[PDB]
């Protein structure tokens, strides 16, 4: 019974882990709470690794949020960020904790990336100022475990998402993510029959979306793989796995598949007169799918399950 | 033995046409596949014609998609319905092809058309937005025919089929139409053991279907009836023929049918909270029935029949 330690277990990422995680007799899980543990503290996460016996480790513990908060606190976002990485994985080290899965993002890839994204994109140029300090940190956290796994012979693993959705994301049409931002934007017309809704853009724009569900699974067939198997699928100065589809959908498909999946029936509308951001973005996922994990929820599906939990805790 | 080319004969409308057909002995069927023959090709189309001495024609090719798709590629579902239905009836006319059947839709009638809708009801009004760009090609479609009847002295006559389902429809819950969508989620529900299934909406509407067997016997019907007979019943600038059952059945009756056809045990629930559409939609079959032909499945045979080939080919 491997003893395994989720790093913010009731954030949106993690949470998913430990529902799935949870189903597994062949794992115990050793969780905390922000009030009974503060990842920002090196002594009591020292302590705690010092006192707990932990196999595994994933860490879904972040400082996460939307382009106004990113824009206004960046200092929260790089510091915060940096000490909850620098802490854990430092005293998972000092403990002799040999298994962890860093968790990384999309976002920490240059503006102009070449589509669709590879792992070698990493650090190939210029990143988006508004995620800036975040992806900074975020990068550090990769090459710290590329750094013990390198010095020390460590196990610490890593994934970059791409854009997620599911339980427990934040469903305010006040959020900077569009699926939430619509879900709740469709619903609220749906109730009060508006006759239509407004969405800033063109809607030509390309984007990929992933269940949070699969984005669990993901993580833990990851964790999972054999280190001989997961060694011949990377490089130890390269070693990050992309998750996501691989597979592109335009914002006008996004809006009228929410519309219809919320039983909407006023008009949706695009204000082209407002810009759009690059033609496309996403994932490229040969490696994933080489080491034979394929995403399981179609974005239909996937809409209106999320949708019908929003639907149970509004 | 005639010789009928049935345009997009794997389509679903397509396909039940050829079924009957084939067992015509004084038909001989000329039959391509889009591999075999892009009808987008004008050239293309104009080789076929002037090669193979063709009787009559079936004009059962279409691009046609659900509420997302025509929302999502509105010019796709314009220009290529204007090109395939102009690429033919041209190709026809000059290869002195005197005999085709244009195949319309209800969704081509005015949002506010009177109900019952009869023939008349086309073009007095605004369109349903999601169905505007096609309805537009579509009506395109039967005022060429009417114009080459007129200008030339052809018989290119016309058939606006009702809401349809039987084999070879896209049953995925996925889909935007009522059927094929709620044949599988009773099916999924049924062996889910799910206790309930909700469907949006009051359950009080009321729509018109029928089985695509029933629309495949109409259509040769019309396509053979005499001239004479056809003329006398129709102005040559009012030439289509709507085909259906002129019969309503409210989606409450449709959904606990359906749960019924399936062998669902669970509870059928309606959840008001979301609008309903217009209260009433289904068309006038007075001409059809004047002209001698009236439907012969009912909705619980049909979708009786309709299930099992889903279950023969899942
Ligand atoms: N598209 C995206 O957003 C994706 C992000 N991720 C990865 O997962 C990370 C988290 O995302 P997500 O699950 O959405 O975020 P959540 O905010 O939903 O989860 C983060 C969790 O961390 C906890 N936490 C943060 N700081 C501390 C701390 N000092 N001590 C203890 N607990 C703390 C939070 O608790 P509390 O609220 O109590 O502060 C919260 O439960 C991201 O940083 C990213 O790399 C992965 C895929 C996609
Ligand atoms: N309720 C409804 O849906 C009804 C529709 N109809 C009429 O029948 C039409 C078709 O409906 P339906 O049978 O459901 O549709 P299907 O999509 O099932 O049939 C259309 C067929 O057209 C073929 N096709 C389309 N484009 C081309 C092309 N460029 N070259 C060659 N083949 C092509 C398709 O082949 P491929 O997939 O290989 O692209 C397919 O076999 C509708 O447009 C409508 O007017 C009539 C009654 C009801």
Same mark, same amino acid.
């Given at each position: ?65 939307? @382009? ?19 802490? @854990? ?49 975020? @990068? ?38 569009? @699926? ?135």
């Amino acid at each position: 019974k491997q003893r395994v330690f989720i790093a913010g277990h009731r954030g949106m990422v993690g949470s998913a882990i430990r529902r799935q995680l949870e189903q597994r007799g062949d794992v115990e899980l050793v969780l905390r709470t922000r009030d009974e543990l503060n990842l920002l503290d090196s002594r009591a996460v020292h302590d705690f690794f010092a006192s707990e016996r932990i196999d595994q480790v994933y860490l879904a513990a972040a400082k996460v949020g939307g @382009i106004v908060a990113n824009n206004t606190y960046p200092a929260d976002f790089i510091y915060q960020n940096m000490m909850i990485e620098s802490n @854990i994985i430092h005293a998972a080290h000092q403990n002799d904790v040999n298994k962890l899965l860093f968790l990384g993002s999309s976002c920490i890839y240059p503006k102009l990336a070449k589509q669709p994204m590879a792992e070698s994109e990493l650090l190939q140029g210029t990143l988006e100022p508004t995620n800036e300090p975040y992806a900074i940190a975020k @990068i550090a956290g990769i090459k710290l475990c590329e750094s013990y796994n390198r010095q020390y012979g460590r196990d610490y693993r890593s994934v970059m998402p791409t854009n997620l959705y599911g339980p427990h994301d934040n469903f305010h049409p006040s959020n900077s993510h569009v @699926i939430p931002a619509l879900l709740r934007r469709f619903h609220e017309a749906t109730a009060q029959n508006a006759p239509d809704v407004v969405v800033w853009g063109s809607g030509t724009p390309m984007r990929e979306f992933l269940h949070v569900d699969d984005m669990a699974a993901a993580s833990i067939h990851v964790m999972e793989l054999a280190h001989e198997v997961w060694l011949e699928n990377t490089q130890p100065m390269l070693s990050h796995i992309n998750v996501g589809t691989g597979v592109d959908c335009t914002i006008r498909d996004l809006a009228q598949t929410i519309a219809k999946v919320v039983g909407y029936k006023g008009r949706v509308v695009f204000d082209a007169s407002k810009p759009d951001g690059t033609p496309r973005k996403l994932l490229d996922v040969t490696r994933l799918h080489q080491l034979g994990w394929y995403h399981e929820i179609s974005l239909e599906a996937g809409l209106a399950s999320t949708y019908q939990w929003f639907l149970e805790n509004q």
